[PDB]
Design a protein around this ligand. Structure first.
Ligand SMILES: N[C@@H](CC(=O)O)C(=O)O
Lengths: 427, 427, 426
């Protein structure tokens, strides 16, 4: 059938085709003179998609974060455990930092010009940095769920997950079963949200097509050029991410980085082509075993984690594309909420979906966190539509660096613990 | 036994007693000089009742909708399943349409002097129709739970129910277990709220008596006339719905409706007398099997379901008694809300208990859905009290189409696949 | 330091942090950098206060649903009525003690803030009927998302009762569903207690900062017409600990000096952390293994009394309203002081168990008279002189908010004979 074939095409290439068809439809609707004809009939689908996607930020944040932070914690993390979780969070932070640096350096979204004048958010007195830190702990977690605050809910969710996993070890049975049932509730909620995200991203082709037809018909923006600069900035950012972060870490931890790249090439290409991080886990394991020298005790637990919480390419994408959305609507980010992006792109990666749409939802999450809202109609929705349309071209490098990150963390861990076979690094 | 005889007197027949006693007490203490004293001493009980009745709407709507959606989702509906569920939803929508039609024909609440002269004219300028349909989708489900928006919560709850059952049909045992646990959480919450609704409806005679005593002894408004109009508008609505909707909907399927009613009379009058749509399930099943000729597999699946999600009588009762409120208080309904009422009534009939007093919780929910809040002390509360008072005269009759629309759709679906042996519908 | 600061017992590592904070605030706010503790140190105190406020709504929703769902309604009614009568009696007696000590010390005596006649003579807004109605929430989620503890307490109790009715049903489906919902709420309460036990490990630094900022800014500003209120309020608290509670226990055959000797831990855990709903685990570990109260009694009367039983906030909301009305230039009326028995109790019931929640609700208990800030009425002078001295009054008046919880739980558990009388024998 037609609708049954529409749900079979690869969802990200469907979204990219939606963006392209939306751009051409808008150019035509300008070439003909039917601006209102698409602003009244084609826009409602765009607003429907924007709302249908912005609905899925708070439930995912809460449930996914609770489950993810209950999966890793000082309770069930041993010696390899904390030494790899510290590494994952540190390298995700450096990845978001490289994202923001390379965004400002490529001047992302500086020449799209779809804002609403130098205003509509005028404050002239931003909050201090220490206050921006204290605002992470919420005075009332339910009021921080209702008011749509993302970072306080992330903090409370992580704390609740750690507390539950502390409970699961207690010597009583009532507390153990209570903690198990609470974690199962949050697991069910997070996975139901992943199904609904699958459905919303199935719809997303039409949503992006509408939000691009409306913007290309109503006014004239630059969506053929700044998207090229975002692709260039993302890929140069991932290149720099590797050849700086992982190279300085390997050099400072005794490993020879040229050898690491020459051996990790197999998992890198496999994830680049296959385009999936959790689907290239066997090949990553095979490379870490037969090529690096990591023992089974270190990479039978690190890689199944580094394929779930070490999202470096996704973090750098959430850096540079947040910066594109911010410079696009004309509200550049200050050095006080350029760190909120880091915090809620590192913590929000501690629990991440594997479904197609784990970058877009997290980008909407970082947008709602840093202070830009996705209300239907605001140019934030239009710039997010352009980024979501380009998504299918960034996913490849995203997953390549995603699987190079944990493959470079396993080698470091197994070397620091003297459980790395030195015989597989020389001759 | 000082309370037990009161608590055991059949509710909905102590509510009508509360209404009549309130009317007569407001009469005898209205032209005796005690209006201030009845507002200071008696009306606080009606205030407490209105607060206790608003306390239930959000938890009951969220939990009941989630469980009902997960009960009739497309993940478990077969062929007869969809063929009967699209019927159960279309007939409820047409039933509320007939309710609005017949409630604007009789001018249900036109001769009631609630509210004030005009109040304010700025209350106009509603959002467009398509903007309402987009406002069905919530930007934040927790923010729609807090702000008391009962239609977006309905949508999110239906979505979450369908997601939870699509989970329960998954292969991974961990996620199936998590989905079962989440569904049992929502089931337990819905059942606890049904218990609380039972308690509140046990208290409701005092609340209706107090509100009626206050409104009578204060403004001596019409309570006999307009209630004799709404009881009669609802009954003409029911009669018209049977004789029009079910007759055309049986005749367009080759089923002669005359003999349909002639052989459904037994179940009809049994549900009319017993005032229970669930307590007439044995008679409904025997009359669908023997006297009508429907195969076993169909009426063993559509009657136990239709007695819970197909309420074409309370749908029409809400469609008429929300016109009653919106015409008595002095805020006539706009076409942008004569559709919110339909969607809310239809999607709220999807999960209902049948507990005596759950046809008025749906009315409170529909009121909170169109905009008319039950603000305590405001004319919406007094009009809703006058409606809830006459909940026996309406119940005896609207418990009959509730189960006529069950064996009127079972026969349709049995005919649509040749399980309805025409040896019974001949001569 | 490795695992050292995390394995020193919490009581005398919060008390030590408080002592170090007092001495540091003094020697650094009297001698050298007195404005650096506002930039570098006070933010840690703010982090601690926000962490304490984070754990009030879930700890009063879940720990009340699983509290009221563990008592059969037959005993729940009796315990609830007994404990509500007790809380209200102690509150209406604490306000009276506050009034008599505020008229005894003559608080706000040598302050003439420039008022001619003073508008504090007709201050009778409240009705108590709309107040008894506001207990019932019109929306439970909207009363959770707004930090209202009384409506959510009502809903949590009426939900625990519904659950303990459901677990006696014939349908095994609804039986299992109610048990699963009860397990969710029990797990939420237990996780909240673990989070509180983890926050009390940061509590040394938080108390250090919160008291360093005060003992640096108000190191010398507790002399003059202000010391008297700190000398009155505290005396008030002393009387409340010594006259009311003791006598109450002396009526029910419960040794008072032993009661204090046993509640020492909860007293010094609420006096330094300033929150009566963040010392709830330390109060439960005192009522169960040192007092001898059956779990069904305290598991409900402690999460309830942690918020609605404040016999110190009331005794503080009497002396301080009397002070802010005496600094205007006219004492409190003999008949107007009786509404303080009703407006400082109805404000000591909705007030949340968080630090510095007495000075905030003091604005509401002053809205009974409702004066404006700058001109003609020094209600933001004789209340800016109090908010600056709050974190000292907000330490003793939250020691009695948990001694009241413990005394009421001991009374209710001894009247119902569910108290283990093998503990008070020595
Ligand atoms: N912090 C106090 C409340 C207050 O003083 O306002 C307590 O809960 O004990």
């Amino acid at each position: 059938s037609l609708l049954r074939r529409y749900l079979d095409y690869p969802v990200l290439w469907k979204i990219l085709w939606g963006l392209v068809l939306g751009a051409v439809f808008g150019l035509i609707a300008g070439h003909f003179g039917y601006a209102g004809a698409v602003k009244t009939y084609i826009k409602p689908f765009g607003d429907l998609f924007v709302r249908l996607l912005k609905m899925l930020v708070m439930p995912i944040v809460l449930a996914s974060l609770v489950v993810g932070a209950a999966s890793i914690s000082p309770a069930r993390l041993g010696r390899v455990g904390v030494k790899i979780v510290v590494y994952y969070l540190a390298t995700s932070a450096m990845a978001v930092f490289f994202g923001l640096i390379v965004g400002r350096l490529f001047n992302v979204g500086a020449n799209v010009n779809l804002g609403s004048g130098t205003g509509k958010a005028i404050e002239a007195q931003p909050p201090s940095l220490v206050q921006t830190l204290l605002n992470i702990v919420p005075t009332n977690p339910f009021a921080s769920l209702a008011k749509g605050e993302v970072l306080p809910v992330i903090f409370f969710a992580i704390i609740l997950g750690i507390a539950i996993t502390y409970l699961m070890n207690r010597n009583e049975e009532r507390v153990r079963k209570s903690a198990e049932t609470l974690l199962r509730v949050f697991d069910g909620l997070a996975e139901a949200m992943y199904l609904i995200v699958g459905g919303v991203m199935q719809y997303a082709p039409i949503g992006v097509f509408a939000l691009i037809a409306y913007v290309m018909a109503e006014q004239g923006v630059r969506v053929v050029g700044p998207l090229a600069k975002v692709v260039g900035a993302v890929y140069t950012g991932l290149f720099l991410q590797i050849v700086i972060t992982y190279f300085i870490l390997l050099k400072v931890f005794g490993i020879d980085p040229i050898k690491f790249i020459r051996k990790a090439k197999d998992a890198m290409i496999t994830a680049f082509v296959t385009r999936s991080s959790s689907g290239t886990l066997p090949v990553t394991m095979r490379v870490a075993e037969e090529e690096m020298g990591v023992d089974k005790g270190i990479f039978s637990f690190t890689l199944p984690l580094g394929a779930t919480i070490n999202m470096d390419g996704t973090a750098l994408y959430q850096g540079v594309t947040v910066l594109f959305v911010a410079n696009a609507i004309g509200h550049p980010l200050t050095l006080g909420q350029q760190l909120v992006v880091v915090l809620t792109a590192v913590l929000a990666s501690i629990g991440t979906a594997g479904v197609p749409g784990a970058g877009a939802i997290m980008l909407a999450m970082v947008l709602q966190s840093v202070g830009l809202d996705l209300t239907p109609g605001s140019p934030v929705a239009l710039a997010y539509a352009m980024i979501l349309g380009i998504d299918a071209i960034l996913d490849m490098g995203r997953t390549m660096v995603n699987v190079t990150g944990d493959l470079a963390g396993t080698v470091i861990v197994a070397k620091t613990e003297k459980e790395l076979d030195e015989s597989k690094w020389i001759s």
